[PDB]
Every structure is written in C-alpha cells, then in structure tokens.
Design a protein around this ligand. Structure first.
Ligand code: NDP
Ligand code: IXE
Length: 186
C-alpha cells in the first residue's frame, strides 16, 4: 500500500463546512483538482482508497458517490454496514488502515486519501508516521460550523512546489485560492 495523505480545502478562518455543505459557493476547478489528486494512481492495476467520516460521505451529492475510480471507505461506529454505494465500513481510522493490509485490499490499494471530516483529519495529523497534507487555502473568511485542525509547522513542512500542483494564485467566482502541500515524517 502506498502513501497516506489528507486533502482539504480551507477558508482563512479554518472553516471546511457549514451544515454539511462547503462554506463557499462551488469552485468547479477546485473540485476538479480534488478529483484528479485522489483518483490518479501511479501503480498499474491498483486504485487509491478514499477514507471519510459518515457526515462527509452524506455531504457528497448522491450523483457523485461513490467517488468514481477510487475505493470508498466510510468510518462509523453507528452504521452496521457500508452505506448504499460505499465499498467498505470501519469503526476507526486505525481499523481502516489495518484493513488495507488484509488480503482483500493488500494488493488493490495504491495511495490512501483521508477526506475529512474534522475528527478523522485530527487523528491522522497527530499520529506518528510519514503523512502529506494537500491543502487548498481559500483566501477569504466564510461562515463555518466545522473547522480544519491546527497544522503544527514545527513538524509539517510546506513544500516549495510539487509535481501536478499549480503554485500560483487561482481564482473562481471572484474567490482567490492557492494549493499547498505539507509533509511530515515523525
Ligand atoms: N472542504 C473540505 O476540505 C471538506 C469539507 N468537509 C465538510 O465536513 C463537514 C462534516 O463535518 P464533520 O463533523 O467533520 O463530519 P465527519 O466527516 O467528520 O463525520 C464524522 C462522523 O462519521 C463517524 N466517524 C468520524 N470519524 C470517525 C472515526 N475516526 N472512527 C469511526 N467513526 C468516525 C462518526 O459517526 P458515528 O456516530 O456513526 O460513529 C462521526 O459522527 C461536511 O459538511 C463537509 O462539508 C468534508 C470534507 C472536505
Ligand atoms: C467533501 N467534499 C464535498 C462536500 C460537499 F458538501 C459537496 F456539496 C461536494 F460536492 C463535495 C469536498 C469538496 N472539495 C474538496 N476539496 C479539497 N481540496 N479537498 C477535499 N477533501 C474536498 C472535499
């Protein structure tokens, strides 16, 4: 199994969601970037596996779920089976990562992409190991009710550029944003 990554888009006041939607109006190319980064796998005959909390899973429009071309795994302690359209269910992040080592998935999974919510990000970010964060900075404040956890820059290094990621300022619907990639290894 390849690398472990989180991917998020975040406003200046650290918001990632409001009432199970994004805080900002749809940014079509930002979403295109999210799709491209999570779907693209180097390794022939494998797919990447996206892990998300139950609320994130239900925040994706039914038309778009499961996220096509990736293996979709939902985290939940309440659910007893994967939701309709999902592939896998686990009771914790650690369980999910362990599953990835089982026979069912060991040779199927390339990169693992955590896509929220707020508590799945936090546990990933604070667990020892090699982890990258792909962070889109939406450069304006937006009213939010969910937030991205604190990035500890003592351990997460912002990379000066990364292949496949644009380095300059993007703008859609009058909202400026930029892409960043952070890396820790501890
Ligand atoms: N813009 C961005 O970058 C992104 C924003 N978002 C936003 O996130 C918002 C959702 O907020 P948030 O509270 O984070 O929702 P989450 O996606 O974190 O949902 C968490 C729920 O799923 C289950 N769960 C979560 N973590 C675990 C875990 N670690 N182990 C086992 N089960 C777990 C729990 O349900 P249970 O009670 O059944 O156990 C929990 O109530 C959405 O509205 C969406 O808009 C989401 C992704 C990206
Ligand atoms: C979870 N998700 C999402 C949430 C919604 F509410 C939607 F209506 C939607 F179409 C996608 C989403 C959207 N854009 C993202 N962009 C980046 N960079 N990273 C994510 N994890 C992400 C998630």
């Amino acid at each position: 199994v390849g690398s472990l990554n989180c991917i998020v888009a975040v406003s200046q006041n650290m918001g990632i969601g409001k009432n199970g939607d994004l805080p900002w109006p749809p940014l079509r190319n930002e979403f295109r970037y999210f799709q491209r980064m999570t779907t693209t796998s180097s390794v022939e005959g494998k797919q990447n596996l996206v892990i998300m909390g139950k609320k994130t899973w239900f925040s994706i429009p039914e038309k778009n779920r499961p996220l096509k071309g990736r293996i979709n795994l939902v985290l939940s302690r309440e659910l007893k089976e994967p939701p309709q359209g999902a592939h896998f269910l686990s009771r914790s992040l650690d369980d999910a990562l362990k599953l990835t080592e089982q026979p069912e998935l060991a040779n199927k999974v390339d990169m693992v992409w955590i896509v929220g919510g707020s508590s799945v990000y936090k546990e990933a970010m604070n667990h020892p190991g090699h982890l990258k964060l792909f962070v889109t900075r939406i450069m304006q404040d937006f009213e939010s009710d969910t937030f991205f956890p604190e990035i500890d820059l003592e351990k997460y290094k912002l990379l000066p550029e990364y292949p496949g990621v644009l380095s300059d300022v993007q703008e859609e619907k009058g909202i400026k944003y930029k892409f960043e990639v952070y890396e820790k290894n501890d």
